[PDB]
C-alpha cells in the first residue's frame, strides 16, 4: 500500500487523477478518479486541450466492440467507440486486466483546457454506466479477474497542485487517525448514503432529516463542493452568516461567485462554524457523525477564499469539500462506506475535525427519499 501512497495528483478545482496504462505496448494516461460515474473513458483523438490520447491502432491487445456510446450532460457531452484492452495502474496493485474502454472521439464541455488528465475512471456501479448496465465497470473487472479485495479507499489532501492517495484493494492505517465508522451504501448505483441529522456549531438545523437526502445523497470525488438541497442550503447559509455575522460579506460570496480576502495570516477562522453530518450507522437506531472545519468549505484561490458550499437540485453531494477532511473507505464487499479523520486535513489550533459515535437515532429509514 505504501507503493500506492501519493498516487493521486491534480490542480485545484480540476479533480484528482491517477496514472494508468492501456494497451500493448502500454500507453500512459492521467485519469480522473470519479466515484460519481461508472465508465472508463479516455480521449482517443487529438482534441487541442489534451496532452496525449489513447491510440487504439497501436495496441495489439485492443478489441473493437463494434458499439458506440453517448454520454450527455447538463449542456455538454462525450461520445466514443467501445472496446476492451489491457489496463494497468503503475502505482496501484501489481496486476493487469482487460476492461471496457470508451475511446472518446468527440466531446463538448468535457475536457478542461489546461488540465493534465486525459480521461475518467468511473468507480460507481454498472447501474448508471452507459450505454446500459451491461457495460461492466473497471473495478468490477479488476476484482473478478484478480485477487484484489473488493474495496478501495481515498485520501484526498487538497493543497496550485493537489495530492492524494487511492489505496486499491485495502486500507492504509497511516492515512487516518482515530477510528473508522461505517455508513451503509443505501443502494448500489451511485455511492448513496443517508444523512440523518445536520448541526452547525453543535446546534441542530432543526429540519426533517428527509430534506437532507432529497432526492439523494452521494459520495462523489468527482465534485468539488459540498452540495446541499435548496431548503438545506439556505438554512445552512443563514446559520453560517449568523455565526460569522461579526463580519459582512457580499451576496456574491455566499454564491461561490465573489470571493473574500484578509491580510495574509489573519483569516478569522474562529468566526466560522463547524458543520456536522450524522450518517446512518451499521446498527439499528445507531448513527455516527462527521464534522468539517471551516478550512474545509473555505477554499483558497494576502489570503482570499471562496465559499465552497453550493446548492443543489439533485440531492446532497459530498465532494472534495467533505472528502478532503476524511479518509473514505469504499467497502464494496460489505455495502458500506467508512469515514475517519484524515491524516492530511488542515486544522485549527483550537478546533479539530472528527468522526465520532455512537448516537441514538430513531426511524433513520424515514430519512431516505422515495
Swiss-Prot record:
Residues 1-370 are extracellular. Residues 16-340 form the Peptidase A1 domain. Disulfide bonds join 157-344, 209-367, 261-304. Induction: Up-regulated by the Ca(2+)-regulated transcription factor NFATC4. Glycans are attached at residues 94, 113, 285. Inhibited by RTN3 and RTN4. GO terms for biological process: amyloid fibril formation; amyloid precursor protein catabolic process; amyloid-beta formation; amyloid-beta metabolic process; cellular response to amyloid-beta; cellular response to copper ion; cellular response to manganese ion; detection of mechanical stimulus involved in sensory perception of pain. The modification N6-acetyllysine is found at residues 67, 206, 210, 216, 230-231, 238. It is a single-pass type I membrane protein. Its EC number is 3.4.23.46. The keyword Transport does not apply. The keyword Hydrolase applies. Expressed at high levels in the brain and pancreas. In the brain, expression is highest in the substantia nigra, locus coruleus and medulla oblongata. It catalyses: Broad endopeptidase specificity. Cleaves Glu-Val-Asn-Leu-|-Asp-Ala-Glu-Phe in the Swedish variant of Alzheimer's amyloid precursor protein. Changing residue 215 to N: Almost abolishes beta-cleaved soluble APP production. One of its GO terms (molecular function) is protein serine/threonine kinase binding. It is found in: Cell membrane; Golgi apparatus, trans-Golgi network; Endoplasmic reticulum; Endosome. The active site is at residues 34, 220. GO terms for cellular component: axon; cell surface; dendrite; early endosome; endoplasmic reticulum lumen; endosome; endosome membrane; Golgi apparatus. Monomer. Interacts with RTN1; RTN2; RTN3 and RTN4; the interaction leads to inhibition of amyloid precursor protein processing. Interacts with SNX6. Interacts with PCSK9. Interacts with NAT8 and NAT8B. Interacts with BIN1. Interacts (via extracellular domain) with ADAM10 (via extracellular domain). Interacts with SORL1; this interaction may affect binding with APP and hence reduce APP cleavage. Interacts with NRDC AND NRG1. DXXLL motif is required for a proper endocytosis and retrograde transport to the trans-Golgi network, as well as for regulation of lysosomal degradation. The transmembrane domain is necessary for its activity. It determines its late Golgi localization and access to its substrate, APP. Responsible for the proteolytic processing of the amyloid precursor protein (APP). Cleaves at the N-terminus of the A-beta peptide sequence, between residues 671 and 672 of APP, leads to the generation and extracellular release of beta-cleaved soluble APP, and a corresponding cell-associated C-terminal fragment which is later released by gamma-secretase. Cleaves CHL1. This is Beta-secretase 1. It comes from Homo sapiens (Human). The gene is BACE1. The chain holds residues 60 to 446 of 501 of the full protein.
Amino acid at each position: 500500500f505504501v507503493e500506492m501512497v501519493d498516487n493521486l495528483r491534480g490542480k485545484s478545482g480540476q479533480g484528482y487523477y491517477v496514472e494508468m496504462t492501456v494497451g500493448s505496448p502500454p500507453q500512459t494516461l492521467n485519469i480522473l478518479v470519479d466515484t460519481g460515474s461508472s465508465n472508463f473513458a479516455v480521449g482517443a483523438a487529438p482534441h487541442p486541450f489534451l496532452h496525449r490520447y489513447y491510440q487504439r491502432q497501436l495496441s495489439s491487445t485492443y478489441r473493437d466492440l463494434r458499439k458506440g456510446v453517448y454520454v450527455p450532460y447538463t449542456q455538454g457531452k462525450w461520445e466514443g467507440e467501445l472496446g476492451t484492452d489491457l489496463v494497468s495502474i503503475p502505482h496501484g496493485p501489481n496486476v493487469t486486466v482487460r476492461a471496457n474502454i470508451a475511446a472518446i472521439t468527440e466531446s463538448d464541455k468535457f475536457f478542461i483546457n489546461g488540465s493534465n488528465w486525459e480521461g475518467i475512471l468511473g468507480l460507481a456501479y454498472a447501474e448508471i454506466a452507459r450505454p446500459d448496465d451491461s457495460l461492466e465497470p473497471f473495478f468490477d473487472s479488476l476484482v473478478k479477474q484478480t485477487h484484489v479485495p473488493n474495496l478501495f479507499s481515498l485520501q484526498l489532501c487538497g493543497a496550485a497542485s493537489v495530492g492524494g492517495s487511492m489505496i486499491i484493494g485495502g486500507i492504509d492505517h497511516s492515512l487516518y487517525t482515530g477510528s473508522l465508522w461505517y455508513t451503509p451504501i443505501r443502494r448500489e448505483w451511485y455511492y448513496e448514503v443517508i444523512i440523518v441529522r445536520v448541526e452547525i456549531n453543535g446546534q441542530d438545523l432543526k429540519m426533517d432529516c428527509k430534506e437532507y437526502n432529497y432526492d439523494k445523497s452521494i459520495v462523489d470525488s468527482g465534485t468539488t463542493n459540498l452540495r446541499l438541497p435548496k431548503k438545506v442550503f439556505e438554512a445552512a447559509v443563514k446559520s453560517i452568516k449568523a455565526a460569522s455575522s461579526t463580519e459582512k460579506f457580499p451576496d456574491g460570496f455566499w454564491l461561490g461567485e465573489q470571493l473574500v480576502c484578509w491580510q495574509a495570516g489573519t483569516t478569522p477562522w474562529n468566526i466560522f462554524p463547524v458543520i456536522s453530518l450524522y450518517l446512518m450507522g451499521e446498527v439499528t437506531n445507531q448513527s455516527f457523525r462527521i464534522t468539517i472545519l471551516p478550512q474545509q468549505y473555505l477554499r483558497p484561490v494576502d489570503d482570499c477564499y471562496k465559499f465552497a458550499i453550493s446548492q443543489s437540485s439533485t440531492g446532497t453531494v459530498m465532494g472534495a469539500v467533505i472528502m478532503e477532511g476524511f479518509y473514505v473507505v469504499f467497502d464494496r464487499a460489505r455495502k458500506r462506506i467508512g469515514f475517519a479523520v484524515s491524516a492530511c486535513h488542515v486544522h485549527d489550533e483550537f478546533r479539530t475535525a472528527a468522526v465520532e459515535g455512537p448516537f441514538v437515532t430513531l426511524d433513520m429509514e424515514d430519512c431516505g427519499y422515495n
